[PDB]
Amino acid sequence: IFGFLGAAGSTMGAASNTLTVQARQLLSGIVQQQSNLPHLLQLTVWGIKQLQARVLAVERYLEVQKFLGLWGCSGKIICCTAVPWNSTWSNKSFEQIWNNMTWIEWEREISNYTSQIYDILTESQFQQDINEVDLL
Amino acid sequence: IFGFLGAAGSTMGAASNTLTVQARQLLSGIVQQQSNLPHLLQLTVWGIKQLQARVLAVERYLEVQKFLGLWGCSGKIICCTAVPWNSTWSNKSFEQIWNNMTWIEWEREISNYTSQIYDILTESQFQQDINEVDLL
Amino acid sequence: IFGFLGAAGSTMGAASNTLTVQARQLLSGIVQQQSNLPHLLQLTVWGIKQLQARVLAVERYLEVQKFLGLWGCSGKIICCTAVPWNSTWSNKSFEQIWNNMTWIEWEREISNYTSQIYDILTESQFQQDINEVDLL
Amino acid sequence: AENLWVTVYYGVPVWKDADTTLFCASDAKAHETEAHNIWATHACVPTDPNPQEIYMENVTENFNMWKNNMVEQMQEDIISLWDQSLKPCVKLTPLCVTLSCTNVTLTNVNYTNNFPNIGNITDEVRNCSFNVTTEIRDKKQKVYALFYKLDIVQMENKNSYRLINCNTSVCKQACPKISFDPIPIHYCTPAGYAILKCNEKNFNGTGPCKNVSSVQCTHGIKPVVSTQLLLNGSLAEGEIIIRSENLTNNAKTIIVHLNKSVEINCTRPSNNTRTSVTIGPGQVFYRTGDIIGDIRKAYCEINGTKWNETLKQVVGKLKEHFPNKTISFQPPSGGDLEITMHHFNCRGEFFYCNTTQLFNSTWINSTTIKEYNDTIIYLPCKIKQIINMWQGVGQCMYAPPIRGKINCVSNITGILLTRDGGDANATNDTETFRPGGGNIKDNWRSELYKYKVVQIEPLGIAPTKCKRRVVE
Amino acid sequence: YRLINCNTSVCKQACPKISFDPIPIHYCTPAGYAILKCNEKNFNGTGPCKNVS
Ligand SMILES: *[C@@H]1O[C@H](CO)[C@@H](O[C@@H]2O[C@H](CO)[C@@H](O[C@@H]3O[C@H](CO[C@H]4O[C@H](CO)[C@@H](O)[C@H](O[C@H]5O[C@H](CO)[C@@H](O)[C@H](O)[C@@H]5O)[C@@H]4O)[C@@H](O)[C@H](O[C@H]4O[C@H](CO)[C@@H](O)[C@H](O)[C@@H]4O[C@H]4O[C@H](CO)[C@@H](O)[C@H](O)[C@@H]4O[C@H]4O[C@H](CO)[C@@H](O)[C@H](O)[C@@H]4O)[C@@H]3O)[C@H](O)[C@H]2NC(C)=O)[C@H](O)[C@H]1NC(C)=O
Ligand SMILES: *[C@@H]1O[C@H](CO)[C@@H](O[C@@H]2O[C@H](CO)[C@@H](O[C@@H]3O[C@H](CO[C@H]4O[C@H](CO)[C@@H](O)[C@H](O)[C@@H]4O)[C@@H](O)[C@H](O[C@H]4O[C@H](CO)[C@@H](O)[C@H](O)[C@@H]4O[C@H]4O[C@H](CO)[C@@H](O)[C@H](O)[C@@H]4O)[C@@H]3O)[C@H](O)[C@H]2NC(C)=O)[C@H](O)[C@H]1NC(C)=O
Ligand SMILES: *[C@@H]1O[C@H](CO)[C@@H](O[C@@H]2O[C@H](CO)[C@@H](O)[C@H](O)[C@H]2NC(C)=O)[C@H](O)[C@H]1NC(C)=O
Ligand SMILES: *[C@@H]1O[C@H](CO)[C@@H](O[C@@H]2O[C@H](CO)[C@@H](O)[C@H](O)[C@H]2NC(C)=O)[C@H](O)[C@H]1NC(C)=O
Ligand SMILES: *[C@@H]1O[C@H](CO)[C@@H](O[C@@H]2O[C@H](CO)[C@@H](O)[C@H](O)[C@H]2NC(C)=O)[C@H](O)[C@H]1NC(C)=O
Ligand SMILES: *[C@@H]1O[C@H](CO)[C@@H](O[C@@H]2O[C@H](CO)[C@@H](O)[C@H](O)[C@H]2NC(C)=O)[C@H](O)[C@H]1NC(C)=O
Ligand SMILES: *[C@@H]1O[C@H](CO)[C@@H](O[C@@H]2O[C@H](CO)[C@@H](O)[C@H](O)[C@H]2NC(C)=O)[C@H](O)[C@H]1NC(C)=O
Ligand SMILES: *[C@@H]1O[C@H](CO)[C@@H](O[C@@H]2O[C@H](CO)[C@@H](O)[C@H](O)[C@H]2NC(C)=O)[C@H](O)[C@H]1NC(C)=O
Ligand SMILES: *[C@@H]1O[C@H](CO)[C@@H](O[C@@H]2O[C@H](CO)[C@@H](O)[C@H](O)[C@H]2NC(C)=O)[C@H](O)[C@H]1NC(C)=O
Ligand SMILES: *[C@@H]1O[C@H](CO)[C@@H](O[C@@H]2O[C@H](CO)[C@@H](O)[C@H](O)[C@H]2NC(C)=O)[C@H](O)[C@H]1NC(C)=O
Ligand SMILES: *[C@@H]1O[C@H](CO)[C@@H](O[C@@H]2O[C@H](CO)[C@@H](O)[C@H](O)[C@H]2NC(C)=O)[C@H](O)[C@H]1NC(C)=O
Ligand SMILES: *[C@@H]1O[C@H](CO)[C@@H](O[C@@H]2O[C@H](CO)[C@@H](O)[C@H](O)[C@H]2NC(C)=O)[C@H](O)[C@H]1NC(C)=O
Ligand SMILES: *[C@@H]1O[C@H](CO)[C@@H](O[C@@H]2O[C@H](CO)[C@@H](O)[C@H](O)[C@H]2NC(C)=O)[C@H](O)[C@H]1NC(C)=O
Ligand SMILES: *[C@@H]1O[C@H](CO)[C@@H](O)[C@H](O)[C@H]1NC(C)=O
Ligand SMILES: *[C@@H]1O[C@H](CO)[C@@H](O)[C@H](O)[C@H]1NC(C)=O
Ligand SMILES: *[C@@H]1O[C@H](CO)[C@@H](O)[C@H](O)[C@H]1NC(C)=O
Ligand SMILES: *[C@@H]1O[C@H](CO)[C@@H](O)[C@H](O)[C@H]1NC(C)=O
Ligand SMILES: *[C@@H]1O[C@H](CO)[C@@H](O)[C@H](O)[C@H]1NC(C)=O
Ligand SMILES: *[C@@H]1O[C@H](CO)[C@@H](O)[C@H](O)[C@H]1NC(C)=O
Ligand SMILES: *[C@@H]1O[C@H](CO)[C@@H](O)[C@H](O)[C@H]1NC(C)=O
Ligand SMILES: *[C@@H]1O[C@H](CO)[C@@H](O)[C@H](O)[C@H]1NC(C)=O
Ligand SMILES: *[C@@H]1O[C@H](CO)[C@@H](O)[C@H](O)[C@H]1NC(C)=O
Ligand SMILES: *[C@@H]1O[C@H](CO)[C@@H](O)[C@H](O)[C@H]1NC(C)=O
Ligand SMILES: *[C@@H]1O[C@H](CO)[C@@H](O)[C@H](O)[C@H]1NC(C)=O
């Protein structure tokens, strides 16, 4: 087993058995504690650098939870989608991705197209909801 | 293809084919940027309006996501439900709704009962879980 | 028929029928209003307690929504999982659990193990999602 | 039918009228001059290089000028920024004591390039000597300074003066290295709100607009402050537009918004040198040492024919709302110096121009077209240093002199009129409009009249024939 | 004589009840961020580090 980010160097297929380790630490921190001991203690130099740390944690977490909701992957860690891979984003074979690259190397390779894959994934889920409305 | 609120004047039939354009923009904003250049700049007049415009953006997103969680529609754009229309809320036909109204007029006719439709929606989802715990 | 926290004294069997009553009120509050009338009103002593009351409410809601996302119980009130209670956490019979125990007493006598049930419930869902990837 | 079930749609295009906390976004290309502007500070977030405006087609929305909340937020922001820019730096409490002024004697150039030939700054400034304290408390020094006659009041013992603010407040010197340049400011909404903009070119204040469009935030708005004529504005599209909350209520100001600018060209030909004394520990007070070279009153020149045609068009528009009366302009009838005279700013110097040749005339019936020759109107202007911009809410300020010659080239995109009340016994078919009037808010209603802030309600409920698959 | 500072500014007196003792301070990130630390002992200023933790 590994700690937070502990499998950052392992390959894509082997570092995917530790997704829950980096997914359990997106809101949990030390910042929620009040202080060592509690004028206007909320306007101290470190009373504002802690107020904006609480807000940064919320927006960072809600930034990906918004995409999971649109794509239909709410409440799931690994989510299968009905969007075919056109291989123009990357035409590497199965064994050259899951057994040869790294999650950092892979995400830098298709960083060009992630702005478009997000649009395709969102629109594909919308088409699924239209289909079931005129089906049930 | 339309932009933000671009089909607000179109009828409910044709304004419901562009729900994703008004859904991609409930958290994304310019406010996540830092500044033109980085005393106590987190207290400037322009630096307090930017703090409360980040909390407003977060809160306005959760008050619509909170309802989706209770009704069992999390992760879905169009969500069917087992709550029957009694026509006391609105006794119009199917054609007179989806071919003769825009979304703004429709939300003004049933503005009386949305406080009650929400409670009926919540109870139905709760009754789905009780009927499923004591059945499996 | 009950109010907020109205079933805190009832037995667990009869206090699980009012789950929605305590669930509708994890974001809703008086704080979201602006003021009696709109110097520097945004940094009054009570203009700061309202700012930190809004953040506390948002964070409190997101501490339970974070777990439900990992456990796979997003969009549900009573979510039935696949983790077997091994009776080491509690060996009390099914009758004694739901028929003279209250929700407060139950949480206390398993309070030693909630830190371990939470990690087990996350691992079972992750193992579910891996099994579907190499099955579909 | 009997097969209708509630279906939730997420993202539907609905909104409700609401009020939010607009933040500021300004372009960084104009900034990075290290000038430390007052309004459009570096704190404003960078703007989107390609803003989006979506044409909403079939929707008519009830816009309501004179009740827009966007204006009051701008007012509070302007006041707060003005106050916080004056906070850090030097006060003027040890300065104003019993002065002693005598008529100034100057050595100067003779011809002075007498093309306008308006006047000479003598009998406007006084060369007053007074005792201040140096960096050491137990040492007083006698120093001289040139003060315009509008900054000093004459107490008893007529050969002894005092500053105009001592017995009412304490003023802080305009702070030496900041700028008063109005840099455009965009007012952007949080994520969850939108701004509806009415695109009708001939659109009065309030009413249902039929050509609404949606934006994320407004165009550039300059916080320029003026009293009688709107400066550096945005031109009307269709024609001259006359807007007022109610045209039959003379207590309500009238805003005449033009569709063709009339440039006004202002200059201070004098040569003021800036000297610095020390009134305390690390506190430096700037003053005018001498006036050497050219000596002439500051003045503003205007093309006579352009302004004359502009008044013709404004009167043509005004005759429609007042059908059977002649329209006659008259100069302001009284009030403060900020009302009776067109007040504005250049490079830190605060100008008060007379503007009485622009604003009186009569238009009886347009019986015949009268042809004249090209003329240039020369408006005399005074200059003030002790500036109380906002009567009782803004901090009083002392603007230091600016070395060199001051020259501004600005546009006149609007006029602020105020109808004179009428009587019942006898109205000789005449109406007189006098310029000025209104508060500072009317300088920003002229920009924020197109915009309304709305809150998006993306949760819709409608019946459908689909039923949720109940699990067995 | 005169005080050294009497032409530049005015100095508030160091204030009796406060202490100048430096207590160690830990700079911690919010949730969603992390701090990479280069464990190489013979590490100069810039460049790649090979046992980042
Ligand atoms: C690099 O690291 C080096 C190692 O850390 C560092 O050197 C260290 O520097 C610190 C500087 O703070 C030293 O700590 C001080 O040590 C003082 C020594 O006191 C001697 O004399 C006392 C008699 O006056 C003896 O009692 C004392 O013996 C006992 O002292 C302790 C009780 O005070 C006890 O716990 C010990 O176990 C020991 O048995 C010793 O022989 C010490 O006087 C001083 O105490 C202050 O700080 C304490 C907290 O650390 C407070 O608890 C204590 O009350 C003192 O605070 C007062 O003074 C502060 C400074 O003015 C104020 O802020 C406080 O509010 C408080 O002032 C109140 O009380 C006043 C009356 O006393 C009153 O007049 C005021 O108005 C106010 O009301 C402190 O502990 C440390 O000893 C150094 N290390 C070594 C090995 O010597 C070095 O500096 C570092 N390098 C650099 C560049 O910084
Ligand atoms: C209606 O709209 C018009 C058009 O925008 C507007 O006119 C313009 O006003 C601005 C603001 O005053 C003018 O900008 C200033 O112009 C002077 C003129 O300098 C001439 O000579 C220099 C050579 O020395 C030329 O390079 C220059 O182009 C001019 O021909 C400048 O001297 C001013 O410079 C200051 O601001 C710069 C901003 O980046 C600084 O970089 C520069 O160092 C100067 O700053 C100094 O003063 C600051 C305080 O003000 C201080 O903080 C600094 O430390 C430093 O000491 C400035 O560029 C512009 O020329 C006008 N344009 C025209 C065509 O007239 C009207 O003002 C407006 N109406 C109203 C009522 O506002
Ligand atoms: C870093 O790379 C080395 C070399 O590839 C990895 O070591 C191998 O790991 C696999 C995975 O189980 C073993 O089958 C091999 O026996 C290991 N040794 C060699 C020489 O290949 C190492 O696991 C990588 N680091 C991490 C954290 O996975
Ligand atoms: C509080 O406790 C009393 C027991 O003293 C509960 O009263 C019992 O309620 C059950 C179920 O309604 C009945 O079957 C018993 O006959 C009742 N006993 C008595 C003595 O009244 C009461 O319901 C509890 N209240 C709440 C809100 O849980
Ligand atoms: C029903 O609940 C009661 C109390 O909540 C349990 O009875 C208690 O038993 C303990 C001994 O273990 C006694 O000290 C208490 O005095 C009893 N309570 C009362 C009110 O007399 C009982 O065990 C529960 N039912 C079952 C089947 O266990
Ligand atoms: C709604 O407002 C838009 C604003 O762009 C109008 O578009 C302009 O209309 C004028 C008047 O004919 C044209 O001269 C311009 O070429 C149009 N485009 C632009 C960019 O200005 C539009 O006409 C208005 N009315 C309708 C029905 O759309
Ligand atoms: C500005 O608006 C005025 C309206 O007050 C326009 O004046 C009209 O111009 C047309 C030109 O075709 C004439 O036929 C009208 O008689 C004029 N009206 C009046 C009352 O004189 C003027 O053209 C507009 N200018 C611009 C540049 O838009
Ligand atoms: C604004 O005023 C300045 C000076 O008052 C103008 O510059 C002068 O214009 C006159 C016009 O006949 C020329 O003769 C001079 O040679 C110009 N320069 C100087 C130094 O006097 C300037 O042109 C005016 N701007 C506008 C737009 O009218
Ligand atoms: C304002 O008055 C003072 C004193 O009355 C003038 O200061 C003197 O001016 C004369 C001019 O001939 C100089 O010779 C002296 O050296 C100056 N100082 C003193 C202490 O006498 C000052 O020049 C006057 N200012 C103006 C603009 O006339
Ligand atoms: C003041 O404005 C008038 C316009 O009313 C200008 O007169 C025009 O000048 C241009 C260029 O010299 C000619 O082509 C026009 O025929 C003139 N008349 C009209 C009615 O446009 C005059 O030039 C302006 N004054 C200055 C100094 O520029
Ligand atoms: C602006 O200038 C006009 C003159 O162009 C001033 O009007 C004169 O005011 C004096 C003051 O009592 C009268 O005696 C004159 O009869 C007025 N008319 C003329 C033609 O001189 C006017 O006062 C000036 N504005 C201000 C605020 O003083
Ligand atoms: C003053 O007004 C003139 C004319 O109205 C402006 O000159 C034009 O401004 C527009 C802005 O929409 C530009 O697109 C043009 O390129 C400018 N020149 C011409 C010949 O049309 C001038 O910009 C205005 N001054 C200020 C400071 O706004
Ligand atoms: C990277 O740094 C780590 C530091 O934890 C090294 O691991 C330690 O190295 C030291 C010195 O060689 C040993 O004394 C320790 O026993 C090692 N382990 C621990 C837990 O401290 C690691 O060796 C470094 N990387 C490489 C490739 O040597
Ligand atoms: C792959 O890319 C091509 C062109 O970029 C596009 O036509 C195709 O739709 C893409 N694949 C999918 C599944 O959209
Ligand atoms: C994958 O794409 C690259 C770039 O277009 C191309 O050079 C390569 O031949 C492709 N691989 C295959 C197997 O077609
Ligand atoms: C329709 O609304 C009325 C309003 O009181 C309610 O009583 C009724 O139960 C609703 N219809 C159904 C089928 O429940
Ligand atoms: C039962 O759960 C407890 C939790 O502490 C654990 O210690 C024990 O090993 C578990 N037993 C089995 C058989 O999993
Ligand atoms: C100063 O102004 C007066 C007022 O008309 C004028 O007579 C005189 O020539 C001007 N110049 C001097 C040096 O007095
Ligand atoms: C300044 O003080 C000196 C000596 O104290 C005195 O002679 C002179 O008249 C004073 N000047 C004033 C009060 O303007
Ligand atoms: C504005 O004009 C429209 C028609 O052009 C009219 O219906 C409306 O009442 C007017 N509003 C005002 C305030 O005059
Ligand atoms: C204006 O004042 C400066 C200050 O020294 C001087 O150098 C300059 O020559 C003066 N202007 C003229 C035209 O002499
Ligand atoms: C302005 O136009 C009117 C037209 O009645 C004329 O009487 C007046 O002399 C004109 N003004 C100038 C300065 O030419
Ligand atoms: C405009 O100025 C005065 C202002 O009252 C007015 O009486 C006069 O008739 C007009 N013309 C001149 C030249 O004063
Ligand atoms: C540090 O040392 C390594 C290896 O000696 C070298 O590659 C790197 O450039 C050095 N960095 C600097 C800043 O000298």
Numbering used by the authors:
A (entry chain B), B (entry chain H), C (entry chain I): 519 to 556, 564 to 661
D (entry chain G): 31 to 136, 136A, 137 to 187, 189 to 309, 312 to 321, 321A, 322 to 355, 357 to 405, ...
E (entry chain A): 191 to 243
The authors write:
Cryo‐EM analysis with 3D reconstruction of the J038‐C1080‐3BNC117 complex at a nominal resolution of 3.4 Å confirmed a single J038 Fab bound to the V2‐apex of the C1080 trimer with one 3BNC117 Fab bound at the CD4bs of each protomer (hereafter, we refer protomers as P1, P2, and P3, clockwise when viewing down to the Env apex). Unlike V1V2‐specific antibodies, such as VRC26.25 and PGT145, the heavy chain complementarity‐determinant region 3 (CDR H3) of J038 did not insert into the trimer interface at the V2 apex. The interface between antibody J038 and the C1080 Env was well resolved with clear density for glycan N160 extending from the surface of Env to interact with the heavy chain CDRs of the J038 Fab. Overall, the interface between J038 and C1080 Env trimer buried 1298 Å2 surface area from the antibody and 1439 Å2 from the HIV‐1 Env. The epitope of J038 contained both protein and glycan components, of which 89% of the surface was from V2 loop of protomer P1 and 11% of that was from V2 loop of the P2 protomer. Glycans N156 and N160 on strand B of V2 loop on P1 contributed 45% of the total epitope surface. The 18‐residue long CDR H3 of J038 formed extensive anti‐parallel β‐strand (main chain) hydrogen bonding interactions with the V2 C‐strand of protomer P1. Through the two base GlcNAc, BMA and the Mannose moieties on the D3 branch, glycan N160 interacted with J038 heavy chain by forming 5 hydrogen bonds with N30, R54 and Y100D in all three CDRs. Interestingly, when J038 bound to the Env trimer, it induced the V2 strands B and C in protomer P1 into an “up” position. In the J038‐bound mode, the tip (Cα of residue 165) of the loop between B and C in protomer P1 moved 11.6–18.7 Å away from the apex compared to positions in other antibody bound forms.
